[PDB]
Amino acid sequence: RMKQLEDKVEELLSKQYHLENEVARLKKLVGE
Amino acid sequence: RMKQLEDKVEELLSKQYHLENEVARLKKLVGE
Amino acid sequence: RMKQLEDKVEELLSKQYHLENEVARLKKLVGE
Structure with a gap:
């Protein structure tokens, strides 16, 4: 439970x- | 509470x- | 170890x- 989640969160x-x-x-390309 | 989590990560x-x-x-459409 | 997870999900x-x-x-700014 805990471990699996931790994996998937990182x-x-x-x-x-x-x-x-x-x-x-x-954002840079397009325009600011 | 773990299923909850699974749910938000879901x-x-x-x-x-x-x-x-x-x-x-x-990214593709924009280009330079 | 629970608060840590919770805090990361945030x-x-x-x-x-x-x-x-x-x-x-x-997207709107590109028409897309």
């Missing part, structure tokens, strides 16, 4: 950090 | 996948 | 809301 958190860097870079 | 998993999809797509 | 939940917001706009 992965999603991992993904999230990247997703944000991408969106930040998308 | 939600986050899904929303993350549709987000990434949207972003990848946008 | 970072993800929090960032998730903001990112969907960011992309939703860029």
Whole structure:
């Protein structure tokens, strides 16, 4: 239970950090 | 309380996948 | 070890809301 969740949360958190860097870079292109 | 959690992570998993999809797509369409 | 998990589910939940917001706009801002 606990462990499984913990795994799945660090992965999603991992993904999230990247997703944000991408969106930040998308914002730059398009226009500020 | 653990099923609860499974439930919110369940939600986050899904929303993350549709987000990434949207972003990848946008990245493509936008271009430089 | 429970509060930690709970506290992480919130970072993800929090960032998730903001990112969907960011992309939703860029979408309209691109026509997409």
